[PDB]
Amino acid sequence: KKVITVNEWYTTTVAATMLGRRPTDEDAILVSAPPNVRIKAVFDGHAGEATSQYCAKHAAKHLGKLSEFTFAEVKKACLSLDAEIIRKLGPKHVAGSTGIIVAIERLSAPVVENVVGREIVPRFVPLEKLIQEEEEAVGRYPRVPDVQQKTIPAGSFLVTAINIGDSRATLIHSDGGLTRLSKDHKPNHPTEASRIEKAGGSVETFDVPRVDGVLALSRAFGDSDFKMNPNLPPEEQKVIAVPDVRQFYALSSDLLLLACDGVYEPSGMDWAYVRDLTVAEMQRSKGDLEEVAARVMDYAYDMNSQDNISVMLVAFHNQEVEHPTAVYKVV
Amino acid sequence: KKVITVNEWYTTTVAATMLGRRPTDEDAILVSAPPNVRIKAVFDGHAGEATSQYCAKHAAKHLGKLSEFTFAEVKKACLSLDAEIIRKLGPKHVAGSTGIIVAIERLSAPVVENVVGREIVPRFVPLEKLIQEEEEAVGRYPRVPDVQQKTIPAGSFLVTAINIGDSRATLIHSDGGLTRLSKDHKPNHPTEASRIEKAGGSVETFDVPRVDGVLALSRAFGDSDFKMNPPPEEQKVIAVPDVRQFYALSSDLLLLACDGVYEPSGMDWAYVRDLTVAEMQRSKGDLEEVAARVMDYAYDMNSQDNISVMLVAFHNQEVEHPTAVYKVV
Ligand SMILES: [Pr+3]
Numbered sequence: 001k002k003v004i005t006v007n008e009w010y011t012t013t014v015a016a017t018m019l020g021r022r023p024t025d026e027d028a029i030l031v032s033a034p035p036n037v038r039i040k041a042v043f044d045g046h047a048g049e050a051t052s053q054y055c056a057k058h059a060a061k062h063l064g065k066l067s068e069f070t071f072a073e074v075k076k077a078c079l080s081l082d083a084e085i086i087r088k089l090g091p092k093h094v095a096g097s098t099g100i101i102v103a104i105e106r107l108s109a110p111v112v113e114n115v116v117g118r119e120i121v122p123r124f125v126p127l128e129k130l131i132q133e134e135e136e137a138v139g140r141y142p143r144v145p146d147v148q149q150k151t152i153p154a155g156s157f158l159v160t161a162i163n164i165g166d167s168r169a170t171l172i173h174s175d176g177g178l179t180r181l182s183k184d185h186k187p188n189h190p191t192e193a194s195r196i197e198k199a200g201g202s203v204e205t206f207d208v209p210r211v212d213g214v215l216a217l218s219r220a221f222g223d224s225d226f227k228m229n230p231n232l233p234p235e236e237q238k239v240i241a242v243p244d245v246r247q248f249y250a251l252s253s254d255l256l257l258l259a260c261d262g263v264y265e266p267s268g269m270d271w272a273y274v275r276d277l278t279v280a281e282m283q284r285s286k287g288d289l290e291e292v293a294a295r296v297m298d299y300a301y302d303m304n305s306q307d308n309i310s311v312m313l314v315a316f317h318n319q320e321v322e323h324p325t326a327v328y329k330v331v
Numbered sequence: 332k333k334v335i336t337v338n339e340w341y342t343t344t345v346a347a348t349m350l351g352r353r354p355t356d357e358d359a360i361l362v363s364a365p366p367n368v369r370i371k372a373v374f375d376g377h378a379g380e381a382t383s384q385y386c387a388k389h390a391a392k393h394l395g396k397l398s399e400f401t402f403a404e405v406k407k408a409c410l411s412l413d414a415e416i417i418r419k420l421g422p423k424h425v426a427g428s429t430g431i432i433v434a435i436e437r438l439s440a441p442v443v444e445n446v447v448g449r450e451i452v453p454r455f456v457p458l459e460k461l462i463q464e465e466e467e468a469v470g471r472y473p474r475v476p477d478v479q480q481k482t483i484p485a486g487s488f489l490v491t492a493i494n495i496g497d498s499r500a501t502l503i504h505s506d507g508g509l510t511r512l513s514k515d516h517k518p519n520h521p522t523e524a525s526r527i528e529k530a531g532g533s534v535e536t537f538d539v540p541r542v543d544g545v546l547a548l549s550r551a552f553g554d555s556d557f558k559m560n561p562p563p564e565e566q567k568v569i570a571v572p573d574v575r576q577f578y579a580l581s582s583d584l585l586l587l588a589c590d591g592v593y594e595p596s597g598m599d600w601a602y603v604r605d606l607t608v609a610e611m612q613r614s615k616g617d618l619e620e621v622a623a624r625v626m627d628y629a630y631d632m633n634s635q636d637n638i639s640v641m642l643v644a645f646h647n648q649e650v651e652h653p654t655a656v657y658k659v660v
């Protein structure tokens with residue numbers, strides 16, 4: 001219902017959030033922050049809103065100083081922020097928060113890269129493959145493409161997806177296809193379970209697999225009580241603030257959609273269904289971004305999601321926006 | 332309770348809106364639009380949201396083109412936007428919208444002007460005087476000051492208040508004092524009723540004075556059905572704004588709100604100022620909390636309208652890590 005629309009640089013960004021069936025809304029959205037670099041994010045907090053709101057307000061500060069968006073550089077940036085969060089909000093019982101962050105850069109000239117679909121192979125296992133392995137453990141998603149050399153046209157955007165937790169980012173192509181930019185960090189998955197056990201933790205399933213039978217996520221900012229091993233660095237604790245870092249290219253005709261777990265909780269509503277809703281609403285509404293975000297949010301609520309629901313959509317332009325504006329309206 | 336906070340340039344701006352007891356929310360807020368000049372605004376629509384939202388999206392397009400924010404130039408800009416609105420959404424039955432717009436210009440060097448309080452005299456009856464005369468026809472507001480020659484320090488902001496309707500803009504000083512940037516456009520006032528009359532219309536009192544017994548406001552964007560006499564500036568309802576010049580210090584707080592915030596009695600200019608000051612203290616300067624709280628008050632005070640508020644704080648230094656954040660509370 002209540003949507004913010006920012007028209008600036010080479011993008012049109014719309015964002016909205018709702019309490020849903022929860023007493024408070026712990027979701028926070030970084031709508032935009034800065035040469036030729038934009039940073040946007042959706043932070044999903046739990047057990048409090050102090051950490052997610054801190055992240056929204058300060059994540060750009062750390063990521064914004066980076067000269068390259070490599071795993072190593074991004075990793076030190078996230079741990080730096082996490083330490084700052086724990087220091088300022090703790091030291092004990094610090095609320096936690098997921099974080100799906102994107103660093104968007106525009107190409108003013110074409111570039112040649114090796115790619116697997118939209119994922120740029122760094123100069124390796126494509127994320128789509130890893131996601132499909134987890135899903136098997138279907139049919140709604142195409143088989144993983146073979147690597148190929150591609151000339152990414154000027155006007156295209158480089159998108160680095162920095163993920164921590166289970167919020168998600170998706171690129172919807174003009175032809176309807178989609179690229180999954182993130183893979184949820186769950187305690188029961190191999191890499192995560194290994195770290196947890198090494199740090200002296202357990203992974204027990206009640207309603208859902210939980211770390212020490214408490215936390216549903218294996219990675220998150222905050223959550224100070226699960227990072228007190230100190231015989232191990234912060235990056236090897238039960239729960240860590242180390243992100244997965246992947247890069248993809250987006251064409252000016254794409255749509256980038258970031259959403260929290262609340263949108264995908266109904267248990268039917270997967271990446272594919274969300275794409276179908278977006279595609280259908282873009283058609284029916286005649287391309288009104290604000291309405292499509294509002295409709296995907298209502299669908300999730302109507303399908304009985306019991307979580308806060310937040311979505312951010314980004315459309316890209318071939319030319320700089322002439323008259324930038326930031327507008328807040330309803331519907 | 333959903334707030335947008337934009338930290339950019341030399342300001343921190345927070346905005347929020349709520350349906351309140353209304354079925355829909357037709358308020359639209361222009362949080363910011365561009366050198367060294369901003370534009371911000373609150374548009375309160377009626378009989379539809381198309382017009383208010385159109386204004387938020389395109390007002391700055393027209394105003395931003397201006398070399399100077401004088402009345403002649405601003406009036407041309409507003410009439411142009413109005414024609415465009417009616418041309419795009421009409422011609423007939425176009426929804427209406429009020430408009431409280433502010434053009435903020437930061438000074439890079441001091442300027443010398445003649446002022447009546449914070450109002451700059453063009454090189455005259457101060458706006459405060461008009462408001463006080465109208466309120467009179469026992470004081471919560473100080474007597475109007477004598478004109479003085481002041482040097483506005485660099486780092487200060489020139490603020491042009493462009494009003495069309497009954498939304499309002501207030502400057503809250505660091506010492507608690509307040510400056511009223513606008514005056515409500517009412518159908519029954521001499522200037523308005525006179526124009527309406529000559530246009531073949533009338534003003535009659537029901538729950539409130541109304542144009543032809545229908546519209547609560549005599550000035551607004553859209554409302555094409557009241558602009559078909561055929562000059563645009565002389566129709567029953569017009570989009571000609573009242574334009575006043577002021578100066579704000581980096582220590583002020585600028586508050587823009589729709590009629591919904593002031594609907595309740597006791598919820599007057601002075602009271603909103605009191606609420607804001609109290610909350611800034613109680614929350615140690617949390618702009619988002621003060622915005623939310625002033626809104627809750629209006630609602631608890633039984634306002635039946637949509638509630639929207641925008642607060643702008645100023646800085647002496649350009650923000651170094653600009654952000655636009657949307658959160659709850
Ligand atoms: Pr959640």
Ligand SMILES: [Pr+3]
Pocket residue numbers: 375589590591636637
């Ligand atoms: Pr109203």
